Design a binder for this molecule. Structure first.
Ligand SMILES: Cc1c(C(=O)C2=C(O)CCCC2=O)ccc2c1n(Cc1ccccc1[N+](=O)[O-])c(=O)n2C
Ligand SMILES: Cc1c(C(=O)C2=C(O)CCCC2=O)ccc2c1n(Cc1ccccc1[N+](=O)[O-])c(=O)n2C
Ligand SMILES: [Co+2]
Ligand SMILES: [Co+2]
Lengths: 377, 377
C-alpha cells in the first residue's frame, strides 16, 4: 500500500553534505576511494571567507564536503553581507557538530518543487525549523528543518550546483568513475524509533515503505526518496551495533548512505583495488556457506559465473517478492565506528525501476547467521 | 662556523605529528599522495579509548596523524589509568588546536639520548614546559616543550614506534614508495623572528646555520636537525606570505616540512600523476626563462637531459658554495593557505652527506623574479 500522502511535492535526493574539520583531505580521499569527480567548489578562491566546500559527483550522486575557516576571516560580515555560499552555515554549529560527532553527514538534501512551501508546510506540521528559506541569486531556494540528532533535512528548489559555486577547471577535474550513479537511501540511527518516525512522517507525509535493531522505512510518493531509521534493541547477547553507534557518535545521526551502482561488480573491483592505497575498506566477507547457498535462492537471477563474482567481491544478495538486491557494506568512513557506506544494485520491478525494489537486505541478517553456523559445521 | 653548542645530545628528526579532526582520512590521503606506507596504529582496535593515531613511514620519514575520540569513551580514566598511547595527548588541547589552526603540525619530534635530561636542561634554559618526561613501558621516554605558537618540540629517547602502537598487518599495509626517505628540515612562521630565535637557541643550544620575509636557521651539532624560522616583512608591495599564513592560521605555527627524496625526479613524477586523483597539487611552475638560465648556473651539476626533467616537473634549483639544492613546493596540504610540503634533494658535500648542503633555496627568490621578468620580455 502507498497512500501517496506527501504534504509537498518531492523529487529526488539532491546531495549529501558532510561537515568536516578539513574538507580538502576528506574530499580527496572520498574522490579516490569512491571514484567521484571533483566538480564544483566554494572556498577562498571563489570569494567565500566563511567556509570551504567541495562537491564530488558520480552520476546523479552529489557529495559535498564543508569545513569552517577561521571566523576572523569573516568577522566584519553579517548575514546580509555574508560571503558564505550556503547561508545556513554557522561556524559554531559546524565546529560543535564535528567535535561532538566527528566526521559525518550534516544535511540530507532533497530537491522539491518549492522549498519555501516545503519548509512552511513542514513547520506547520511539526518540523523543527533549522534554517529559514533563503533565495540565492533569485534562482535557487534553500531551507532546512531538523531530521534527527544534529542532521537536517535540506530542501532545495530551482526556478529553472548552487550560486557562488564554481565549476572546477578540467585539469583539476579528473573524470574518475567506478560506476556509482545515485543515492538510493540514507539511514538514521536514533535511540527511539517510534518518536523519530512520528516526527518525520508527521511533517513530510512520507509513508512507511512496505539482530540488534528495529527499523522502519519512510518514503515519498514515488518511493524514490527513502529514509530508513533504526533503533537499538537492548538485552541481546551481542551488543546492538545501533547502540554502539549512539555511544561513539554522541547520540542520533546518519548511519549509512546506500549508493546505487550501474555495475556493482565493476564498482567493487575498482573500490577494492584502492582500499589499502587511500580508499575504503570493506566489512569482513561472510563464509563460503553463504555463496554455496546462493544458487538455491537466486540461481533464478544470477548465473553461476555472476555468483562466482559475488564470492570474490564479498557481495551479499537478498530478495523480496518484487525484486533482487545486491549489497555490500564498507568499514566506517572515518575514525569513529559510526557512519559507513553501502554499495547497492537492484534487479527487477521494471515499469524505469520502481524504488526500493528488493527491499533493504534484512533477509541477509538471518542468512548471514545461518551461513556462519553451517560454515563452522 | 659551528660552535657545536647543543646543551644535550641530539640525534635525528624522529617523527612529525599532525593534529587532525579525522586522522583516518588525512592519513589515507597523505599515504596515497606522498607514497608512504601505513605502518603502525593506536586506536580503538588496540585499546586506546582516547585518541586515534596512525603512523605513515617512507624511509626514515615518520608522519603520525592523531585525532580525539569522544571524551565520553574515556571519562572514567585518569592520567595514571589512561589508555592513550601518547600521554601528552589532551582532548581539549587537540580540539582547540584544530579549531584554531585547522590541520597542521602539533609536534616536531627529535630523538635524543636522554629525553628526561633534554627536558630538564631545556626548561632550566628557558624552555616553556608542555608535557613532563613520561617513561612508557620502561622502554621509551617522551617529553615536550613549547617551540612556537601551539607547536611543541617533542623529545624521544629509547633505552634500546612507541609502546601501545601495533604494527599494521600486511594486507592493510600496501608498500607504497615514491622515493621520499627522511625529513630534512621543519620551518616555523612567527610574528617576530628575534624573540623566537633567542628562545629556541636559548634552551637547545642550537646554532645559527650559515621578498616578504626574514629568516634564520637553527641547527644541532652535526646540523642534521634543522629548524628554520620566518617572520614577515611589512610594507612591501606584494603582501608577505608569512603574514598571510599568520592570519589564516591564527598565529605562529609550522609553515613547511621539507622531505628528502633519494630520487626527486621519480618522486615528483609519482606525486604529479596523483595530484588530481587524491594526492597533492604543486605550486605554479616558473617560466621557461628559468630553465633556459639553468645551464649557466648548474650546467656543472646537471646534464641537459636532467635539466629537461626539471622543466617537465617544475623542479627549482639553487646552489651555494658547498652544494646544489633541488626543490619544489606543494600547494597547501589542507583547506587553509598555511602548511605546505617541500620535496628536496641535495647534491654535494660528501664526506655521508653533511647537513643543509646547498642551503635552503633563498637564491631562488631572486632567480624566480628575474626569470619572470625575462619571460615577459
Ligand atoms: C545495516 C544493514 C542493512 C541495511 O542497509 C538497512 C537499511 O538500509 C534499512 C533497513 C535496516 C537495515 O539494516 C541490510 C543488511 C545488514 C545490515 N547489517 C548491519 C551492519 C552491516 C555492516 C556495517 C555496520 C552495520 N551496523 O552497524 O548496523 C547486517 O549485519 N546485515 C546483514
Ligand atoms: C619557503 C621557500 C624556501 C624554503 O624552503 C625556506 C626554508 O626552508 C628556510 C629558509 C627560508 C625559506 O624560505 C626556498 C625558496 C622559496 C620559498 N618561497 C616561498 C613559498 C613557496 C611555495 C609555497 C609557499 C611559500 N611561502 O608562503 O612562503 C619562494 O617563493 N621561493 C623561491
Ligand atoms: Co541499506
Ligand atoms: Co625549505
Amino acid at each position: 500500500k502507498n497512500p501517496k500522502s506527501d504534504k509537498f511535492k518531492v523529487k529526488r535526493f539532491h546531495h549529501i553534505e558532510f561537515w568536516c574539520g578539513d574538507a580538502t583531505n576528506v574530499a580527496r580521499r572520498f574522490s579516490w576511494g569512491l571514484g567521484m569527480r571533483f566538480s564544483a567548489k566554494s572556498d577562498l578562491s571563489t570569494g567565500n571567507m566563511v567556509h570551504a566546500s567541495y562537491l564530488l559527483t558520480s552520476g546523479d550522486l552529489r557529495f559535498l564536503f564543508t569545513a569552517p575557516y577561521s571566523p576572523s576571516l569573516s568577522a566584519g560580515e553579517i548575514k546580509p553581507t555574508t560571503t558564505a555560499s550556503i547561508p545556513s552555515f554557522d561556524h559554531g554549529s559546524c565546529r560543535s557538530f564535528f567535535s561532538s560527532h566527528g566526521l559525518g553527514v550534516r544535511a540530507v538534501a532533497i530537491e522539491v518543487e518549492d522549498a519555501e512551501s516545503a519548509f512552511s508546510i513542514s513547520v506547520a506540521n511539526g518540523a523543527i525549523p533549522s534554517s529559514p528559506p533563503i533565495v540565492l541569486n533569485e534562482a535557487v531556494t534553500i531551507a532546512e528543518v531538523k531530521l534527527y540528532g544534529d542532521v537536517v533535512l535540506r530542501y532545495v528548489s530551482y526556478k529553472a550546483f548552487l550560486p557562488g559555486f564554481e565549476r572546477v577547471e578540467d585539469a583539476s577535474s579528473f573524470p574518475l568513475d567506478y560506476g556509482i550513479r545515485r543515492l538510493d537511501h540514507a539511514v538514521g540511527n536514533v535511540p527511539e524509533l517510534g518518536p523519530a518516525l512520528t516526527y518525520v512522517a508527521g511533517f513530510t507525509g512520507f509513508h512507511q515503505f512496505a539482530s540488534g535493531l528495529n527499523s522502519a522505512v519512510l518514503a515519498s510518493n514515488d518511493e524514490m526518496v527513502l529514509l530508513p531509521i533504526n533503533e537499538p534493541v537492548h538485552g541481546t547477547k551481542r551488543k546492538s551495533q545501533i547502540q554502539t553507534y549512539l555511544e561513539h557518535n554522541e547520540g542520533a545521526g546518519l548511519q549509512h548512505l546506500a549508493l546505487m551502482s550501474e555495475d556493482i561488480f565493476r564498482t567493487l573491483r575498482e573500490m577494492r583495488k584502492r582500499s589499502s592505497i587511500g580508499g575504503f575498506d570493506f566489512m569482513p566477507s561472510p563464509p563460503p556457506t553463504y555463496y554455496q547457498n546462493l544458487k538455491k535462492r537466486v540461481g533464478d537471477v544470477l548465473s553461476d559465473d555472476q555468483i562466482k563474482e559475488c564470492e570474490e567481491l564479498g557481495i551479499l544478495v537478498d530478495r523480496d517478492d518484487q525484486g533482487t538486491l545486491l549489497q555490500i557494506f564498507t568499514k566506517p568512513l572515518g575514525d569513529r565506528p559510526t557512519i559507513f557506506i553501502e554499495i547497492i544494485q537492484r534487479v527487477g520491478c521494471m515499469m524505469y525501476q520502481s524504488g526500493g525494489c528488493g527491499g533493504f537486505g534484512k533477509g541477509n541478517f538471518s542468512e548471514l547467521f545461518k551461513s556462519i553456523e553451517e560454515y563452522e559445521k
